[PDB]
Amino acid sequence: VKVKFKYKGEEKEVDTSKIKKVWRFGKFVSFTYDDNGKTGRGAVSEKDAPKELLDMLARAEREKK
DNA sequence: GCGATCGC
DNA sequence: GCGATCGC
C-alpha cells in the first residue's frame, strides 16, 4: 500500500513495506521508514491515513514493550 | 509542546 | 546522554 504524505511541504510517497515504526502523535500518525539505508520520517494526519497504516499502528501499539 | 524514534 | 526530527 502506498502512503502519500507531505515532507516539508513537498509530496512524498512511501510503501507500507518500507515503514518501520508507527505511532500516534497528537493529530498525526508519525512513522519512520527505510529510505535506501537511511531513516526517513514522515507524518500524515490521522483522518487522512489509509487503512493499512492504521492497521500497522494498531499492531505497533498492542506490542510496544 | 505533543510521542516516539533515532542520530550522534 | 542528549537533543533533533517529523507538522503545527
From Swiss-Prot:
Record field: pH dependence: Highly stable from pH 0 to pH 12.
Xref: InterPro entries: Chromo-like_dom_sf, DNA-bd_7a-e_arc
Processing after translation: Lys-4 was 70% monomethylated in form 7a, 25% in form 7b, and 20% in form 7d. Lys-6 was 50% monomethylated in form 7a, 40% in form 7b, and 50% in form 7d.
Keyword vocabulary terms for this entry: Cytoplasm, DNA-binding, Methylation
Temperature-related activity annotation: Hyperthermostable.
Modified residues (N6-methyllysine): 4, 6
Domain of life from the UniProt record: Archaea
UniProt miscellaneous comment: Sac7a and Sac7b are truncated versions of the Sac7d protein, most likely resulting from post-translational processing, or degradation during isolation.
Protein name: DNA-binding protein 7d
Organism: Sulfolobus acidocaldarius (strain ATCC 33909 / DSM 639 / JCM 8929 / NBRC 15157 / NCIMB 11770)
